[PDB]
Each structure stands twice: as C-alpha cells, then as structure tokens.
Symmetry: C2
Subunit: 113 residues, 2 copies
C-alpha cells in the first residue's frame, strides 16, 4: 500500500479522521498549489483553505461544483505537513480555478506582477 | 496607541514559554491591516544549503529565510513586533523561489 501523494490542483482533506465521515464537521478542505515532486520529497505542500461560507471578499475564488459551490480563500496560502497530518483526496479543481487562485496570490504578494 | 501592523518586506518576531521566531512579511500593509493576517516565511540562522533557503545578511548575526514555508499568520492576535526590514534584492529572491512552487 502506498499513501496518496497530493498533486497540484487536488482538493484534499487535511487531518482526516475516519469518524466524522464524508462531511468532516469542523474541517476545511484545501486546494494543493505545489508540484508533486516537491510534495513527495518534503512531505509538505502549499495549499489554500476552502469553505462553503462565501462572503464575497476580494481573495475568494469560486469553486463550481457538480455537488454544490464553494470558495478557495486564496490569500490564506499555507505550508502544510500533509504526510505527517494525513491527507486524503476529495476531488480536483478545474484548470481555470487553479489559475485564478494563483493569479490572486500573484497580485497579493507581487511575484511576476 | 495603535498596534504595529506588519508591512511588506518587514522582518518581525511572531508566535509562529511563548517563544518567538523571526519571519519575513510578504503581504502589503493594506491587506494586513484590513484582515489581521499576513503572509510570511520563517527564518533560521541554521543554513543547510537547502534549495529554498534565501540568505539574509544583517549587521549582526546572519541566517536564511525558508521561502517554501509560506504561512498565513494572524499577526493581530499573536503580537508581531518589528525587528527590521529585508533588503529589496532579498525580498525579490524570496518571491522568486515561491514563484517556482507556484506557476
């Protein structure tokens, strides 16, 4: 058995506990921003929190789901010890959604712009 | 009295015994002030040649910023204080390494 390794664009549950089921009351999922190679080597990844509680704040990025919608909180990027904390895959964000999250971070930090 | 609001490029002490660690602030004052949060990378004196280390040269003690370990931090509620400011070329470098981890 090999542990799941988070890949760029993946929507993951962090701190997964098999006792609150598919809902995970009290948790946020997260969009993975960093590449597989980095994630695999370090046991860490860069990711942004998600929530269904949209407020329409400037750094929100709408995640359009089949199931329902939510937002990535793009300003709140964090380095996460996925391997140590136990991550599971919930889904994958669309290419456009990932692009938009990165664009907003780029604005906030000022990287290429 | 107004609490110190971190600003882009500042080197701060933060709760990241309470115990603090130095961090470079990567988000602009306007954002930091409005949200009570800021983006920052942790610093260490212990260099190891590691790929995402950026050298920070002071006038006393030296170390590196660990550029890959970006963290959104509630400065407002954790008592960030200002210790200094990184040089522009140092901040630019930290941003280059992050840009690598993110398209």
């Amino acid at each position: 058995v090999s542990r799941y390794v988070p890949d760029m664009g993946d929507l993951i549950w962090v701190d997964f506990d098999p006792t609150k089921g598919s809902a995970q009351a009290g948790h946020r999922p997260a969009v993975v921003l960093s590449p597989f190679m980095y994630n695999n080597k370090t046991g860490m990844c860069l990711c942004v929190p998600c929530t269904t509680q949209s407020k329409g704040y400037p750094f929100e990025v709408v995640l359009s789901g089949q199931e329902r919608d939510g937002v990535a909180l793009a300003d709140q990027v964090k380095s996460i010890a996925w391997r140590a904390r136990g991550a599971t895959k919930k889904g994958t964000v669309a290419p456009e959604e990932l692009q938009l999250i990165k664009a907003k971070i780029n604005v906030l930090i000022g990287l290429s712009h």
